[PDB]
Design a protein around this ligand. Structure first.
Ligand SMILES: C[S@@+](CC[C@H](N)C(=O)[O-])C[C@H]1O[C@@H](n2cnc3c(N)ncnc32)[C@H](O)[C@@H]1O
Ligand SMILES: C[S@@+](CC[C@H](N)C(=O)[O-])C[C@H]1O[C@@H](n2cnc3c(N)ncnc32)[C@H](O)[C@@H]1O
Lengths: 99, 329, 88, 109, 75, 95, 329, 75, 99, 88, 109, 95
DNA sequence: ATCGGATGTATATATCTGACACGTGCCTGGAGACTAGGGAGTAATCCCCTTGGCGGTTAAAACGCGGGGGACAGCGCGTACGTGCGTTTAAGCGGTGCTAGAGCTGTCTACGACCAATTGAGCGGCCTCGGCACCGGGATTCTCGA
DNA sequence: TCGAGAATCCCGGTGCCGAGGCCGCTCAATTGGTCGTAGACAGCTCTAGCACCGCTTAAACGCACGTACGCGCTGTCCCCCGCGTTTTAACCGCCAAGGGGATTACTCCCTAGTCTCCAGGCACGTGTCAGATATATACATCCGAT
């Protein structure tokens, strides 16, 4: 006897909540460490002015949001609602990156 | 001003430790140092621990005065008791036993901890220069020492020896004639001259013998080194950040190596799929075979992912076979 | 003392599942299969490696040691990912 | 010597014709630069900036705000179908996305 | 003078020459029968490097001698 | 006591105070407008450079700028852009 | 050397035709020409065909001598019989009847076929210049003549009149005062001076009246034309290929037109969605309303798809309403 | 002198002036009450174009006169 | 009692026949007229050096062949074999031209 | 005489159904719905208009009257459709 | 005056170092051109052309032909996965496509 | 009696007679190789030009060409390309 | 699974044509020798900003449980697409003739680079106030189980 | 078809920090002349784009038949969503150090510009052989049938 929404309405609520805002959606310290340990593959050591890590995060977020916008069209094309990995793989190929 | 001395199982040599012990990282210091070298000797001979687990149990106090001098008193006169066990017609196990893998790893990490004081200074170099510092792990050197099979008539040179841990490990694990390391920079060389001393010291303290080596300071691109590179059997070079101008010159120096000479390298001096036509007959890849070693993880010091090390072998038969199949049509 | 360069490893697990799901919601996705969260980390690691490699090539040509924001803006512009707002 | 008069004022412009002339001249585009090239280019740049700023201001006003922030530049660009082609491959920082939901996802009635 | 040229692959080629022949001719002779350019051939015998300006008689190479052929890199 | 670093901020602000006389701009949006102007400058100027190499001329003139605008901008932006540039060059020569 | 003459229903005027008829395209010549103008008169008055389908049937021989002189003999003395039908107190239908659409189209195509000898010469111009030639269809001019409603106190000017068919059609279909066409190039103007003659000739031959017009050769960008453009009611300009430098000048000349003046144009002199702020107060689009005409197909002469023609109206009330709503806050 | 200014939209504004006022002031007066910039105003009365350098008395405009306001384009 | 192949084998034969060759697959005179009457929308008259029409045909063929190569992946994604217009429309959108 | 410029019209029907089906076979398509043949003509007409418009802009800048093959190669290169073999 | 010697011969090259120097110098790339820039650029251009021509010749040989035609350049490029990235957006005229059929289309057994 | 129009045909042919000594090239394939060389020339030279504007230098040197090659070519082509260029510049200065 | 007939694909042989590869003459661009000036290389100084460590508060991540909706397999029907055949349309090929317009050459005038003096436009530095964010409280809307 | 309850909006109240405006001071844009080369224009030549004709045959077209495939429906089930509790580590505020990025002053060597000269590479011709085309035959795949 609690109250409980039906599966799929809180999702449509989060859609609007996150398409209305402009904030970044990944934590900042985890992403900074990821950048900093990708750049270890160059034997020398580097220092990453802070606006650089911010620029990297902006471009990284904006790449994934549009990849998901294409994955969704692929999934709806197959008469589905759930997105699966075989939709990412088709978006990235038709788009011109995987082949 | 007192001690934390201990006594030599083979020979009569003292170890010295000041009461304020050195400072290391998160949880690491001379406490595990000493307790573990005791553990390694107790694994070395069984009568020692058969005398050294009587009377005692497992853990001990790291910060306390009397627990460490407990361990020192116990160990020192227990080893005197071992000396009396060997006072008779008995003779201990050989002196020239090449140390096992675990024992050797303890030795090298012990030497590195003691000599190198301020490791962050090793990062004082010029960006993207040939002088950048980077270190190879113990496991990759072991893999290489077992992949190449050095006889007693091979010479081993290590270009850019860094601090020297590669040459020390190879000199203690192989039966060759002589071993050389050349290092141009100042800061790593000043530590190399200490590593040499401390390695000889701890090695004869444990009672294990090694080959003979020399950690010199120089420049492998000199006029004096061209014919030492040509008169060498196996070469180890970490040319990850040497760039194309120094690698071109090292290629010009490797052409004069003798048959069956082998190199190992971070980056290959020749493509892994080197074809051969009338156009690349000047390339050094036309007289050598390149094989990529297995990429075990933790191979280098600067990143966590694994890197491969590209064994090359000098074999001029491929060039003559190409020339001889050229006259077939 | 202990070795130089405290090494970092497996930091891709910091791109956590709720973060991937927020990005999916902003992209307009209603229901997410449970195998998406690893395909996505693969895609992200490839993108980031390709951009940071060029940013470091630019920062090494200039004979310096910090990656500035102009290095990232040039590395992005060279792949068709123009970015406005960081000093272009 | 007569009274100075910027080249922008003779053209009727707000953008700097002399600075555009210098940037063309020092930019390795050609051996020589004409006289009307900076005037033409500055007039075009000013037209385009006015075209964007007008729509950005409209979007800021109907959010009940008096300042333009990057979200209003983003909305202005993506809602206009010819600025969206000029800027089809740029990423405006802190700009968000357009509100858009597919009609098969909305709940049925 | 009959000579044998031993290669590093265990191949031996037999050649017929006279001591009065020039070095240019000998290198051409090796090229002629096996196709190896003369500039890549380095000939060593009894620890001596053959010099362009000497003659075969200069090195006291007598009948039924064996020469060693080492192959070099170009430049 | 820094060096002088120039930008289009004051001209962007002068144009804004004509289209919307009672609106302001945030600093981060002035950065975006600044990179926008440079981006379109380099597109047009590089296209005109190329167009003058093709014809074996060595001058960038007001014809190259007009043709580069007609090549780059989309359909209905380009009409108004060339009609702005023409009016400017006319007001200039008749002076 | 004989004739193929025919006789005037109104007035007494001869038409002349040489026996070797002109050469036209795939299947087109003076045969359909004459048979159809006969058909149009028989539709014009019913007594003629009530006399001209007796005695005969439908088709006739185009290449034959005696079939055309059959038609001429029959038509000429049948019209003499009509003249005798009207010899009494009877009076024919009015002379000032503006010709119907089909009759007028026949007239204009007749004039064009006769005067313009070598139409491919009209293509002698400079590429991408303002002097390119292109022609408007009959149906689009009709649509425009019905969209604008010219009273008897309007003046119509046609800038770049080409050969003149636009001014001829408007002068024959509208009741205005005077009509002008100005044309700069040489080749179209030399044909315009023939079109004028031939139109007056054929029009009074049929017996239909028109307004009065003038097809001059000049330059609408001259000093003499600025105040004639400012003193005009409706303007037709085909500025498809004039480019931005001539259109800027025409905009500078249209500012001085009187209220309610209308223009029609291939391309609009003002955007269809022209907003208005403190920055474009010099633009001419701030004092005019632009409406796109319906795109009927076959509208122009150079392509097959339809083109629209953008009626503009001068109305300065929009500027004052903007200024007056400016003082509201 | 009281005057009326008739616009093309059937709007009339009433103004109070004296013949001694300058043309700059009159144009400013129209701007002041309706917001139209003086450079766009063209005033025509009894077929005369008003000239910057004349005075109101110069044109013999008397009390209860009506002026016509035509709007022009800028440049 | 004639002999007749089953539906889908002559198609797989034409696939190989046309993926083995390099000729152009559109008639030349019809395509030339199409080019020539697209270029009528510019009031002036143009002349089309013949290698120009050949270059246009090469690029036009190569555009459509790759568009069909993407349409096929979209159709197979929906568990189909037949290609339909809603697959062209998805390829052209994900690819970045329709939106 | 009769008017200048013999006009051409509806030439897209010359891209016939067998031609579209050969292009589909080279693209690797086994079965073609029957509504594809009009969607394809639409796609082709848009592509060709966009390329020929730039080819004519280039040919008018040079103040000439024939479209050369370099005009087409430049118009294609400007859209990312680089073409090798016609004189680039 | 000594004996002339082309700059290609000092470098060991087959591509024209003097012509590359001229094309860089007359091409509006920079105010000045170094001395090793044409040598480096000509060596790189020659390496890449040899890399393509080798694979094109292989493809021509296993079609049982002794001349290279555009089909062999196409096959060589598309079958190598790093030349296919350099030339990922070019169209080789008269080059065809790679033979490739989807495995769901092949007849079932 | 035409003007002189130059190309890379003879150098392409000299390189081919080294890799495959008994192969020829058709004329249409020599056109393709000719446009390939020009295309890669302009890519590398334009990237080096840009790289020298960024750093406020006014010389295109052998460092700009090396860095532009490392930016443009894919992973394993770029290694061999820089090792070819380095060898050439070395053989040149030591002469 | 195996077998037989008919169709389509590959393989070997002759002949022939036109495009490639090679040789010749000439001319224009690349190499050689040299001088002058400015760009980049190097050493030294300064100070901003990147890195590293600490503690606390709380927001977000991780984990687990319950159930419902959506993915996916199976089955049936019916239309629309493939295959093959006979008829009809125009592409392709060749050959001819014309004349326009692209390409080149020779003069000459206007326009843009360069330079020296000078002064105002635009930048950095510095305040001040108002737009916007954060917060509490009431109203309204929307979802879900009746 | 409608109540309960959770989520979202809307209306005031307080504060702060960033936008906007003002000042002083360099340094870049403007003015006024001079010079020399790019490009504009007139005239000439000759190649190649356009238009026409006829003929042969390949490809497009229209049609009939049947079958495989697209699409709708139904049933199972399991996996993803919504929610509540616990655990982790992000964020924020603060402090301290020292490195490396940015600037300035000198000096030298590498590159542009010039003049002479000569050979490499282009256009033009010309011969021969690689590849296409046609025919004859082997055989490999498909489909109906057992
Ligand atoms: C990458 S470190 C390798 C360290 C060591 N080999 C190891 O694996 O532990 C390479 C060293 O080579 C040295 N080095 C670089 N160039 C050198 C040269 N030209 N001559 C001698 N040593 C050089 C540098 O000092 C650098 O420390
Ligand atoms: C596009 S034609 C229109 C023909 C005619 N209006 C019709 O619709 O039938 C435009 C004509 O305007 C003429 N023209 C162009 N510029 C002109 C000018 N500046 N002054 C006078 N006539 C001009 C040209 O000769 C050209 O023939």
């Amino acid at each position: 006897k609690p109250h409980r929404y039906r599966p799929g309405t809180v999702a449509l609520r989060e859609i609007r909540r996150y398409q209305k805002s402009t904030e970044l959606l990944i934590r900042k310290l985890p992403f900074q460490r990821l950048v900093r340990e990708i750049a270890q593959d160059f034997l020398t050591d580097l220092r990453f002015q802070s606006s650089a890590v911010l620029a990297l995060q902006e471009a990284s977020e904006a790449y994934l949001v549009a990849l998901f916008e294409d994955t969704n069209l692929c999934a709806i094309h197959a008469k589905r609602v759930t997105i699966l990995p075989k939709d990412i793989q088709l978006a990235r190929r038709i788009r011109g990156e995987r082949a | 001003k007192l001690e934390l001395r201990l006594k030599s199982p083979v020979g009569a040599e003292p170890a010295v430790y000041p009461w304020p012990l050195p400072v290391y990282d998160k949880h690491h210091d001379a406490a595990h140092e000493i307790i573990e070298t005791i553990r390694w000797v107790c694994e070395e001979i069984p009568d020692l621990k058969l005398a050294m687990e009587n009377y005692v149990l497992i853990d001990y106090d790291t910060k306390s005065f009397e627990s460490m001098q407990r361990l020192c008193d116990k160990y020192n006169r227990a080893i005197d008791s071992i000396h009396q066990l060997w006072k008779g017609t008995t003779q201990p196990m050989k002196l020239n036993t090449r140390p096992s893998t675990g024992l050797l790893r303890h030795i090298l990490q012990q030497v590195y901890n003691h000599s190198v004081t301020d490791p962050e200074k090793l990062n004082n170099y010029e960006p993207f220069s040939p002088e950048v510092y980077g270190e190879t792990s113990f496991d990759l050197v072991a893999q290489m020492i077992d992949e190449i099979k050095m006889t007693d008539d091979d010479l081993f040179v290590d270009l850019g020896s860094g601090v020297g841990q590669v040459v020390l490990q190879v000199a203690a694990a192989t039966n060759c004639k002589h071993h050389y390391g050349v290092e141009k920079a100042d800061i790593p060389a000043k530590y190399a001259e200490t590593m040499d001393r401390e390695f000889r010291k701890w090695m004869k303290w444990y009672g294990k013998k090694h080959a003979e080596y020399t950690l010199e300071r120089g420049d492998f691109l000199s006029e004096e080194w061209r014919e030492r590179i040509a008169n060498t059997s196996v070469i180890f070079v970490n040319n990850f950040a040497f760039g194309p101008e120094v690698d071109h010159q090292l290629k010009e120096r490797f052409a004069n190596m003798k048959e069956g000479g082998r190199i190992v390298s971070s980056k290959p001096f020749a493509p892994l799929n080197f074809r051969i036509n009338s156009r690349n007959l000047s390339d050094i890849g036309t007289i050598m075979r390149v094989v990529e070693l297995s990429p075990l993880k933790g191979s280098v010091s600067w990143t966590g992912k694994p890197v491969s090390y590209y064994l090359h072998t000098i074999d001029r038969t491929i060039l003559e076979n190409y020339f001889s199949s050229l006259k077939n049509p | 003392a202990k070795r130089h360069r405290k090494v970092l490893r497996d930091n891709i697990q910091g791109i956590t599942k709720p973060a991937i799901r927020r990005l999916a919601r902003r992209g307009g996705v209603k229901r997410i299969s449970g195998l998406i969260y690893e395909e996505t980390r693969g895609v992200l690691k490839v993108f980031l490696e390709n951009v940071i490699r060029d940013a470091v090539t630019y920062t090494e040509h200039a004979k310096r040691k910090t990656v500035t924001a102009m290095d990232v803006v040039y590395a992005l512009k060279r792949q068709g990912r123009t970015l406005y707002g960081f000093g272009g | 010597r007569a009274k100075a008069k910027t080249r922008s004022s003779r053209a009727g412009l707000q953008f700097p014709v002399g600075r555009v002339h210098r940037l063309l001249r020092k930019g390795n585009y050609a051996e020589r630069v004409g006289a009307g090239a900076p005037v033409y280019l500055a007039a075009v740049l000013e037209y385009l900036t006015a075209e964007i700023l007008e729509l950005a201001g409209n979007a800021a006003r109907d959010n009940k705000k008096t300042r333009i922030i990057p979200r209003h530049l983003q909305l202005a660009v993506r809602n206009d179908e010819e600025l969206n082609k000029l800027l089809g491959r740029v990423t405006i920082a802190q700009g968000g996305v357009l509100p858009n939901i597919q009609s098969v996802l909305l709940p049925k009635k | 003078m009959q000579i044998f040229v031993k290669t590093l692959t265990g191949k031996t080629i037999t050649l017929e020459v006279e001591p009065s022949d020039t070095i240019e001719n000998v290198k051409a002779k090796i090229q002629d029968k096996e196709g190896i350019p003369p500039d890549q051939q380095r000939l060593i015998f009894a620890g001596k490097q053959l010099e362009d300006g000497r003659t075969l008689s200069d090195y006291n190479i007598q009948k039924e001698s064996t020469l060693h052929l080492v192959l070099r890199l170009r430049g | 006591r820094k060096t002088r670093k120039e930008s289009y901020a004051i001209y962007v602000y002068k144009v804004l105070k004509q289209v919307h006389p009672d609106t302001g701009i945030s600093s981060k949006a002035m950065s975006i407008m600044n990179s926008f102007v440079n981006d379109v400058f380099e597109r047009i100027a590089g296209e005109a450079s190329r167009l003058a190499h093709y014809n074996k001329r060595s001058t960038i003139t007001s014809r190259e700028i007009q043709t580069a605008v007609r090549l780059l901008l989309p359909g209905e932006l380009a009409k108004h852009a060339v009609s702005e540039g023409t009016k400017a060059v006319t007001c200039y020569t008749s002076a």
